[PDB]
Structures are given as C-alpha cells and as structure tokens.
Write a protein that binds this ligand. Structure first.
Ligand SMILES: CN(C)C(=O)[C@H]1CCC=C[C@H]1NC(=O)OCc1ccc(C(=O)NCCOP(=O)(O)O)cc1
Length: 319
C-alpha cells in the first residue's frame, strides 16, 4: 500500500474532543469541543460521570482565536455535538449531537432541536456524524442510545447504533439499525449530481458499509464496502470525498488517514499523520486543503491534498 507523509501545520490546540470541522457559506471555520468524547477516551468502560456541555467554536484561521458560538443544552442536559454540515438554502449549521439528536445552529448562537422522535414515532437516538446529499436530505449516524433524558450509552460493544435520513419534508426516518458504533458517513454522487451510494463507517469492527441510494430515505443492497487496516483500539471515524470521489477516512488510533478509490475494497494509499488519533476531517472549499482534528493533542491541523475536495451541499446553487 503506498504511503505519503505530507507536511501538517497546527492551527489550534486545547480543544477537548475536537471534532466537527466545518466551513459555512461565508468561508468561516467552526470546530466542536467535546468533553464527553475526550472522557470516553480516558475511561476504562462504564465511567461515563457527568461531563460539561460541549460547545461550537468559531476559529479564526489566521490568528487561532477561538470564539464560543453556542454551548447547547436542553433541559439541563448538556449537548455533545460531534459532527457538522452547513445548509445550502440559508447559512446555518446542522449538528449531530449524541445527547440531543439533530440541531440546527445559527451563527448568532440560537439553535433548534429538530426531533424528539422519528417518523414511525420511536424515541430518537443520539447522533454523531452527518452528510447532506445534493437533494438536501441529511443522512445521519446514531451510535448512542436514546437522547436525553435517557442515560447516555454508546454502541461501542453491542449492536444498537442506527442510521437516519432527515428528509427535505422534515421527516426523520430511521433507515437501518443494529450497528456497532456507526461513525463517519458520506454520500457518493454520480458526476451528474445523482446520489448513488451511502458509505457508513462501523468503527470498532474495522469495516465500511455501503448501500445503494434510490431516493430520499430509500436504501438497499447493504454490503461491506471497505476494509480498514489495523487491530488498534479505534477504527474509522470521520470521512470525506475528494473531487475524484476518492474517500479519505480518519483511522483513529492507526496514525493514518486511509484513501479508498471509488469502488472501495482495500485502501489504495495511506496518509501518515504526526499523531495517532486523527478524528475528523473537512476540506476548505475550492481548495486542496484538509483540516483535521486530532485527539493526541486535542488540536486542529491542516495539510494539502493532491486535489480539491468534493463540493458539499452548501456549495451548490439553488438555480
Ligand atoms: C473518539 N472518536 C474517535 C469518536 O468518533 C467518538 C465520537 C462518537 C462516535 C464514536 C466515538 N468513538 C470513540 O470514542 O472511540 C474511542 C474508543 C473509546 C472507548 C473504547 C472502549 O471500548 N473502551 C475503553 C477502554 O478500552 P481499553 O483501554 O480496555 O482498550 C474504544 C474506543
């Protein structure tokens, strides 16, 4: 397997459980602080022990100054946001939260909780990662048990993690379940803009699953799509496509980001990181620059990739 060792530049530090790197439509950069994430890493099992409410930070990319935008809590229950995407129609962030479900967060710091329950009427589970398709439907992973006020649990040892689609008609549809800690998630699109495949990381099992997408909340042909190397504690966390539809995957605990070609299988290349625990990654729009969050130093870095990123939904035109 070829390996590259590109230069990484540190942008900021001292952000517990650093995750959800995202750019909005104005090109502003946000990251998520997650005390619960950091705690789950330091614990020896059931420990997670009341944690503080994680918040969303604006990070100035020239100066490194952090500004707290929002510290979500609902009804005394601190949120644990973990993954972010920017909307297309309007400038707002959709934030998967392991305690509160799906949030929509404004730049001025107000936020709405989107779903107490799903469309079949079952309680909502805590959400971690999300990806918009080009239709505006949000696919979401849910590795946690029920949202607050249920006790916090995560499917890291047992199969109860679920997948949702929040559709453009505002329905939260459970589309699959019994995952062991579903993590990063992505939508492979055809060159003509059609959504084609849903890729979901199952973290501790060192597997990437795929489904064929036939429409809003309509998936089939569930298959193991990619093998993640290594026997370390961890496995695939965040993931993003490049313009050529190669899938880059943070392999938490391995010191590498894995690169898969469009047909999956085994990684075609690995990216060696100067740290063991890459967690999440996102491209700077219209650039080759990848921002990566990391749990050795609770830091955010950047490196230049060989090509530009795939457009997110937020970068596409209403026309
Ligand atoms: C930390 N991380 C990269 C995540 O993506 C979070 C966020 C939400 C979704 C998945 C989470 N994954 C995670 O926390 O993985 C790290 C991890 C934490 C605990 C464990 C665990 O099973 N036990 C902790 C003690 O294990 P040992 O020390 O005995 O090996 C394994 C991996």
């Amino acid at each position: 397997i070829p390996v590259i060792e590109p230069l990484f530049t540190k942008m900021t530090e001292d952000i517990p459980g650093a995750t959800g790197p995202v750019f909005d439509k104005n090109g502003d950069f946000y990251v998520v602080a997650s005390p619960l994430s950091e705690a789950l890493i330091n614990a020896n099992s059931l420990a997670e022990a009341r944690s503080d409410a994680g918040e969303i930070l604006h990070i100035d990319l020239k100066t490194g100054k952090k500004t707290v935008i929002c510290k979500p809590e609902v009804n005394g229950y601190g949120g644990s946001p973990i993954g972010c995407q920017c909307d297309r129609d309007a400038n707002q962030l959709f934030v998967a939260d392991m305690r509160l479900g799906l949030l929509v967060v404004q730049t001025d710091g107000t936020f709405e909780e989107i779903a107490n329950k799903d469309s079949e009427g079952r309680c909502m589970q805590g959400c971690a990662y999300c990806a918009f398709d080009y239709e505006g439907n949000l696919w979401i992973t849910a590795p946690a048990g029920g949202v607050a006020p249920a006790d916090f649990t995560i499917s890291l040892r047992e199969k109860f993690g679920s997948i949702y689609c929040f559709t453009t008609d505002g329905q939260m549809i459970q589309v699959d379940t019994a995952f062991q800690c579903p993590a990063g998630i992505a939508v492979r699109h055809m060159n003509d803009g059609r959504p084609y495949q849903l890729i979901v990381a199952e973290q501790p099992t060192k597997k990437l699953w795929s489904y064929d997408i036939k429409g809003p909340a309509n998936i089939e042909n569930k298959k193991v799509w990619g093998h993640i190397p290594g026997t370390h504690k961890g496995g695939a966390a965040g993931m993003v496509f490049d313009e050529d539809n190669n899938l880059l995957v943070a392999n938490w605990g391995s010191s590498h980001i894995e690169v898969f070609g469009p047909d999956g299988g085994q990684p075609k290349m690995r990216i060696r990181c100067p740290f063991e625990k890459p967690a999440n990654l996102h491209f700077k729009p219209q650039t080759k620059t990848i921002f990566v969050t990391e749990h050795d130093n609770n830091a955010v870095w950047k490196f230049e990739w060989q090509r530009n990123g795939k457009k997110q939904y937020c970068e596409t035109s209403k026309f």
